[PDB]
Amino acid sequence: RTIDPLSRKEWYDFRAPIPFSSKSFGKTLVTKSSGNRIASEEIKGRVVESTLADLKDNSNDKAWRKVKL
RNA sequence: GAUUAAUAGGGACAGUUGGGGGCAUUAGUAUUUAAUAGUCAGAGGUGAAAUUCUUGGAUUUAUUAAGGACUAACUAAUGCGAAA
Numbered sequence: 473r474t475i476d477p478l479s480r481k482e483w484y485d486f487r488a489p490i491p492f493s494s495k496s497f498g499k500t501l502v503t504k505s506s507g508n509r510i511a512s513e514e515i516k517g518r519v520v521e522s523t524l525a526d527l528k529d530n531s532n533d534k535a536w537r538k539v540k541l
Numbered sequence: 542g543a544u545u546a547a548u549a550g551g552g553a554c555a556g557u558u559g560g561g562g563g564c565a566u567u568a569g570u571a572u573u574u575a576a577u578a579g580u581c582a583g584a585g586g587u588g589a590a591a592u593u594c595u596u597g598g599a600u601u602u603a604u605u606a607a608g609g610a611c612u613a614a615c616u617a618a619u620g621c622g623a624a625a
């Protein structure tokens with residue numbers, strides 16, 4: 473290996489809104505700020521496709537409901 | 542002084558029924574393309590292959606947008622229309 477391609481990558485934990493569990497569900501990858509590119513702002517519009525893996529108690533039976541965040 | 546009133550036909554009317562028609566509306570993924578992000582070396586296609594596309598970054602992934610079509614699944618020895 474020479475220079476792992478993810479060298480510049482920062483990770484972020486997803487947080488779910490009021491109906492769902494406050495606990496993070498997944499994590500996302502983004503490139504570091506370049507002085508033009510602002511790290512936080514490259515993520516303004518991203519879209520998360522999840523089950524209810526997102527409601528701790530009630531989740532396990534509903535794999536049938538997809539939620540976009 | 543006007544025959545009945547055809548399980549003849551025309552008309553009226555009443556609750557329906559239909560994927561019948563004409564206008565408007567309106568959705569839905571899909572193909573194709575574009576944009577914005579990603580990532581990389583292969584994608585396609587075939588019996589094998591080769592023409593093609595690919596580092597100017599394809600195929601692939603996410604989110605939108607444009608544009609013409611088309612109405613899946615439910616869908617059937619079911620329906621409507623004179624037939625198409």
Ligand SMILES: [Mg+2]
Pocket residue numbers: none
């Ligand atoms: Mg469209």
Ligand SMILES: [Mg+2]
Pocket residue numbers: none
């Ligand atoms: Mg359309």
Ligand SMILES: [Mg+2]
Pocket residue numbers: 619620
């Ligand atoms: Mg029917």
